[PDB]
Amino acid sequence: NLYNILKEVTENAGYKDPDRFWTNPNSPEALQAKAIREQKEAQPKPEDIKA
Amino acid sequence: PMDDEQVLRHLDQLVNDALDFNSSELSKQRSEALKYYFGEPFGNERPGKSGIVSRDVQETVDWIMPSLMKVFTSGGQVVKYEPDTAEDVEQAEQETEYVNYLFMRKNEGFKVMFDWFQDTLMMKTGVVKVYVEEVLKPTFIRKDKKKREIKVLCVKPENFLVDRLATCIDDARFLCHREKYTVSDLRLLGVPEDVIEAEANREVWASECYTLLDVDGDGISELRRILYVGDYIISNEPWDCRPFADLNAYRIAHKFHGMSVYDKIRDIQEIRSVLMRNIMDNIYRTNQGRSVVLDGQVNLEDLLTNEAAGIVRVKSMNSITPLETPQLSGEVYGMLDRLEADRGKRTGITDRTRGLDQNTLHSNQAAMSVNQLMTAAEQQIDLIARMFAETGVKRLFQLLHDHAIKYQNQEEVFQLRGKWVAVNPANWRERSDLTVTVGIGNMNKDQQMLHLMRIWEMAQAVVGGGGLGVLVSEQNLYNILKEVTENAGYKDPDRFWTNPNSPEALQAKAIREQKEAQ
Amino acid sequence: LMRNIMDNIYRTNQGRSVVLDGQVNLEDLLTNEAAGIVRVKSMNSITPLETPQLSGEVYGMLDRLEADRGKRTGITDRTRGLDQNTLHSNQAAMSVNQLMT
Amino acid sequence: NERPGKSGIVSRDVQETVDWIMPSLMKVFTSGGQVVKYEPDTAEDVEQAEQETEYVNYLFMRKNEGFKVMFDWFQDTLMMKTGVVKVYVEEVLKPTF
Amino acid sequence: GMLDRLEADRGKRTGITDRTRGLDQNTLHSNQAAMSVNQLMTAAEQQIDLIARMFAETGVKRLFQLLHDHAIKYQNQEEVFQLRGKWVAVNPANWRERSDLTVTVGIGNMNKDQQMLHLMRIW
Amino acid sequence: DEQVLRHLDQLVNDALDFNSSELSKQRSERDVQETVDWIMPSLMKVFTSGGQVVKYEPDTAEDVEQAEQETEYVNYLFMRKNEGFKVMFDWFQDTLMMKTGVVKVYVREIKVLCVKPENFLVDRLATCIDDARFLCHREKYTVSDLRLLGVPEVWASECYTLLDVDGDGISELRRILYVGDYIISNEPWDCRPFADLNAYRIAHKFHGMSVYDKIRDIQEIRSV
Amino acid sequence: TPQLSGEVYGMLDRLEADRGKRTGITDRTRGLDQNTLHSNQAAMSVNQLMT
Amino acid sequence: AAEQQIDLIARMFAETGVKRLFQLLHDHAIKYQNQEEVFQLRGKWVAVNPANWRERSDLTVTVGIGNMNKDQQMLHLMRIWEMAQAVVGGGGLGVLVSEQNLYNILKEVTENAGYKDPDRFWTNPNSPEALQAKAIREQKEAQPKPEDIKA
């Protein structure tokens, strides 16, 4: 719903779909981001030479 | 039932009546307005009196016009067809750029607006004419002949006769527009006798008539344009429409023509001129010395020193008396501030074309003194520009008429080389002016700082916690950067930083990311 | 009010017969309602013939009338915002909501 | 009530009121089609309400004589005390030829 | 303040608004570029017609004797900011924000960052 | 020596009725004595700085034919060769003084001549400044004219009008000099060596307005 | 002619102030703040003097 | 005071001195000598070859054109002072009457005092040192602001 806040802000600006999407509510790219791309960049990412 | 040779005399009778109807009132009004514009005397000046005149239309015109020039001529994106979305480059973008060359860079440039906007400001209306012309000079390899083109011009607005029951451009039962058409051009057209009249040009003023009648003895058909000479032999064919603009410029009620700043401000400038003339009278007459007679008889002091009061004081022995004739009040000069507020607030609220500072820098506190004081709280000039565009789209539509009829198989060079047949295009009869005028369309500074404060920086602040993984991708940020660069003056070449989406970027982006991830 | 102000200034700017009594029938009725310069009548001296000027306090109503001319529906000043010298400062909620719209 | 031979100056005051009332209505109503909503049942909105409200909007957005009609509304209301328009139906053409 | 009031055609018409003017000057320049350059077009037409074997002067580059196949004479030069109107919008923010929050030049930026010098170091 | 000659002579004689007899009043109303030095003298970079403001740029048929060579050659006449930078700004000076600037290309090579546009007599009504009813210019043309072929107080030349003096097939524009007892040489060209460029505020009239023209009241109000 | 007194304007002002005191209290009921702006000192002068 | 008769006397002697000043024109035209003056500068040239010109005017002395001391004092010191302050404040500095004319507008007081050259800095009729100082000021006050982002 923070994304809904941002989408309302952008609608106030006047950019619904193309320029400022800022919605990503539940979409396969958004699903793979929040559940995999963000998660695979947080849980298993700290495995560098420092680890 | 046949109606032949009667239309000649009928419109001959109509011309004089229409001229009596129009020129007596409207021509006199606009000519008086022009005389006011060029400081012709108003009547309050008398011999040995003031001479100050009213000169105020100049500054309001010179405050309104530059904004119109800076807002109109900006790229070739002024008018968008907005057709069905998928196939647009074939006609929606091709024909706009086609009319870009055939209107801009070919026909007088943006000076056409400078030759028509004043008509919408001085003449209460600006009405263009769209006319056919032919091009020549083949091989005399360039074996191309009889080229066709069409331009747009004035017809001396004093020569725009309209019927008495039209009130709209596409309602004129009678229309008349006349041009020079020298006698050598008549001989080019094979005129077989003399004219209405040492010089080949015998003062021939050819008249063009747009009227609908019944020559074929059938139902009332479309108008047939007539090229007259002296109320004589004609050239009539089934025509298409009226190639005109008719910018009322204020959208008055349903009348033939609209109204101008002249009709608004003639009386205000008249009272201003009267005030200045009376101020000069206070300076001049009220400050006259005389013979300085206490009472005296002296035949009214030698009849006011022979109606002059210049140099005489001999009455009998009169003592020192300045003889100060009573003068004007002190509020007359203080009335200047009130009347300046009265008139400047009408349409030129930006005193000296702009509102800015010299002592303190104009920062951007919050919402930019919101939206430029709400576009100076909806200045009427913006709405006048909106009406200008919404009615001048008719110019493009009239162009597209003849383009779809027949022009050429010409090729143009917008952003590339190689274009194709425009012999049989689609007009699409649908246009738009969304991002140019009163429509939401946040202005240059407004959009700039709005994006800077609430889009450019809010994202850069929120990215600290969540990150760009789900937030704005690179392509959208680059689109915002691209519009920012266009706000800097040039869309592409101002500040590239671009690389939005391409194998030279996206594939390069992936391979570079894996380069730094190994 | 504008008509009366302009007619006051017209009557004041117009000259007189420059006479106290005269014997030329008001100097030919002010030179046939003109009265440019005529003082030769009998013995009258050149006198500007002052006229009672109106009260300036009448102007004190015009601005009030200005308020009247907006008090009905549009007393808002010209509905055009101009900030030349001092910018639009805001403390909290923009003086809330621009004085509640 | 004009007296000839003197100043017959007529001060125009209504024009300012009308000409600064006009832009407010224009600015309010000349922005897309956000002005009017159809308010459907919560479960299904775009299926028949959003699409058809935007359809009617386009039938007033650039598919029917633009916004000069709105200006005529407002002029006829403010000046002649009442603004009225009519909505009629015409036939379309361009068959095979 | 009578003289100052009557000077509306002296100070205000002179394109002075406490340095906040010049639209009259810009309009005059654009009109001259669209009117005086017509004299240049006429001169070129006369040199094509009433002259032949033309040359070049003060540059010693190359003589254009003949073969003027075509010409589309028009100008566009009055569309620039005054001193920093086109820069102050994103002058100190692009380099200090785009590469600061996300220092990933190449993915999130471009080589045109060097062009920043062309707008900052150069000027 | 036909009726065309008499018509041209009468047109030249009656040309100066208003072209150079009433526009001079647009000179004084003074303010341009510093306003020009505040705008025109500082506009040196506006006119005489830049080769992109003056660009030909034709279509794909001719793109690298004379794109820069023509501009480079013309840049000589732009400054220091013929009608130089000061002489080109003389057009703006004449626009500030008599509400119109002139660059008259009177002519293998030509030069923008006829400075001091107060010598631009016309038929008192042009409305086009390119294709008017008639046009003229003032030249000295003294008696000592050994340079010219035959010419033996007298100041009259260049009677190039758009009237019916062509005699060939139509009322065409053939350039010729003044009569001078039949001393005019034909030249069938449409050069029309005149500009009449107001370049400040030019409507559909004979000529535009000057800086002092818009400040006529201020001329006697800012000093008197 | 017998000119009217200058206190008639005071009579107009008194009658207008009386009318305002009766029903239309707030002066013009409008806010035009271009140079003179409200200053926050305590709870917005609290609640604009309790409305 | 409606062409005071003292001002009449001054006007008519000012205009009748034109002939006796034509006499001095003739005296200069025939021959005097070829030295230099003693006013406004060090060094002047020879003007012993003039043209009679048959025309001379003395209209700048009295209530005629005549910018007399009373009118100059009052008109300048009140009206042109107010107008100059208005122009400088919000009327404009680089477009309207500027320093190059402010020197002239402020030299009027010095002319009333009689000293032209050595009192005020405001002369610059055509001065190279003032232009060089202006260029130096621009160079020394422009650079740091661009340099801040140039780093």
Short mmCIF file of C-alpha atoms in Angstrom, two decimals, chain B residues 288-289 309-313 352 358, chain H residues 2-3 8 88-91 93 96:
data_model
loop_
_atom_site.label_atom_id
_atom_site.label_comp_id
_atom_site.label_asym_id
_atom_site.label_seq_id
_atom_site.Cartn_x
_atom_site.Cartn_y
_atom_site.Cartn_z
CA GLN B 288 -0.31 82.18 -15.76
CA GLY B 289 0.62 85.53 -14.27
CA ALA B 309 -1.52 88.32 -20.13
CA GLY B 310 2.10 87.84 -21.20
CA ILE B 311 3.81 91.13 -20.41
CA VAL B 312 1.69 94.03 -19.17
CA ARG B 313 1.09 95.56 -15.73
CA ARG B 352 6.85 44.84 -17.75
CA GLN B 358 16.67 42.05 -8.10
CA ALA H 2 4.66 84.52 -17.00
CA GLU H 3 7.78 85.83 -18.77
CA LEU H 8 12.37 89.68 -21.21
CA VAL H 88 17.72 51.74 -10.14
CA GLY H 89 15.46 50.11 -7.54
CA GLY H 90 12.95 48.11 -9.56
CA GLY H 91 13.20 49.69 -13.00
CA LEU H 93 20.14 48.32 -14.09
CA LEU H 96 17.45 51.04 -18.72
#
